Write a protein that binds this ligand. Structure first.
Ligand code: GNP
Ligand code: MG
Length: 361
């Protein structure tokens, strides 16, 4: 039994459209759905074509990593846009990020096809087979496409992209359905006031099934709240299973006190210090005690200091690129997480900024 006249009936896909500068990212996203929520990322919604699809354009990347990381941590499918001759620093950084995230499902969009030639496209694909070997992208399809209605071959490859997205989305729906039995957690990406309709948050159900009228908590505040209503593409729904992008009216909390990265759930760890078992990128600098890094977990980010490095339980003076270690880290602000949340570490002053992934000990 469910609300309304027709069940919402799963079908959804949360897609991140990412990549380097001048890769056609915004153009692709903007042609895949209607412009919605817009901050340092922009949602393009398309619930007109079967699935409740949302495409997130990380449009403030490469300037900021948080734009990229937010897009990726609220999405289940990544579309990496690489333009002709587009094997540059930020393309490599995107590849590294996706591989550190263990990002399962994705597609490479070889954009601007009208500006290139089949033989050049085949050479770029050959090259990519190599760069992606031994990474999570190794079996991603590469689809040549453009979003130019005036090209000789207008919008070639777009239909094939959409078809592949739908194919991948189907696999994700089944994986997300397995999570329905877990306790509910919802990651918040936006919070604002709506007139005569107070505190509203936008986010995604990460696991379980969130239900209208649930009495639960918000972290890191550690405050009791009630879910007053849940909306899915603007229609009130009684429940929202894992993978569902939601709007929620909340009781007992003001939008002014909620930030992106807050979590709705019955229980979260809240700390300002972290002990992470980490694997260090091969493409970063050795990490040393007292060094400063940037930590991402869920949709939160903040500066941290490396207090201690350990290997096999013994303290060391460095963690080299491509090594495994335990890092004891300190920060200022309280962050909320559970042990299943993957952490990323970055050095914002480097060219390739991702340093490591880790999990809380
Ligand atoms: N011929 C052609 N040009 C395209 C296509 N898609 C985008 N462009 C052009 O290439 C430029 C970059 O496109 P854009 O969508 O802004 O990519 P972006 O990666 O979002 N750019 P930015 O890094 O500034 O945010 C724009 O001038 C745009 O008109 C395409 O399919 N064909
Ligand atoms: Mg962009």
């Amino acid at each position: 039994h469910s609300s309304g006249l027709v069940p919402r009936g799963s079908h959804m896909a949360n897609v991140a459209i990412i990549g380097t500068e001048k890769s056609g990212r915004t153009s692709l996203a903007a042609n895949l759905g209607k412009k919605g929520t817009s901050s340092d990322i922009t949602m393009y919604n398309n619930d007109k074509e079967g699935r409740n699809m949302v495409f997130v354009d990380a449009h403030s990347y490469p300037k900021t990593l948080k734009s990229l990381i937010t897009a990726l941590n609220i999405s289940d499918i990544a579309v990496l846009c690489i333009p002709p001759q587009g094997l540059d620093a930020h393309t490599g950084e995107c590849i590294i990020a996706l591989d550190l995230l263990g990002f399962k499902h994705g597609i490479i969009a070889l954009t601007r096809s009208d500006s290139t030639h089949m033989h050049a496209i085949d050479e770029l694909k050959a090259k990519l087979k190599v760069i992606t070997s031994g990474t999570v992208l190794q079996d991603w399809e590469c689809i040549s496409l453009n979003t130019n209605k005036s090209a000789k071959n207008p919008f070639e490859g777009v239909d094939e992209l959409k078809a592949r997205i739908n194919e991948v989305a189907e696999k994700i729906e089944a994986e997300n359905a397995e999570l329905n039995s877990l306790p509910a957690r919802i990651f918040i990406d936006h919070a604002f006031n709506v007139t005569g309709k107070g505190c509203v948050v936008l986010g995604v159900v990460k696991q379980g099934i969130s239900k209208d009228k649930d009495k639960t908590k918000i972290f890191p505040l550690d405050r009791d709240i009630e879910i007053r209503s849940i909306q899915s593409h603007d229609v009130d729904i009684d429940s929202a299973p894992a993978g569902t992008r939601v709007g929620m009216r909340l009781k007992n909390v003001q939008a002014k006190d909620i930030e992106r990265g807050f979590i709705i759930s019955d229980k979260e760890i809240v700390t300002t210090d972290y002990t992470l078992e980490c694997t260090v990128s091969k493409f970063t600098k050795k990490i040393e005690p007292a060094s400063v890094l940037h930590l991402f977990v869920g949709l939160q980010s903040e500066p941290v200091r490396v207090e201690k490095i350990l290997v096999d339980g013994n303290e060391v003076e460095e963690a080299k690129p491509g090594s495994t270690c335990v890092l004891e880290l300190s920060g200022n602000k309280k962050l909320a997480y559970s042990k299943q949340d993957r952490f990323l570490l970055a050095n914002l002053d480097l060219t390739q900024r991702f340093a490591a992934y880790g999990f809380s000990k």
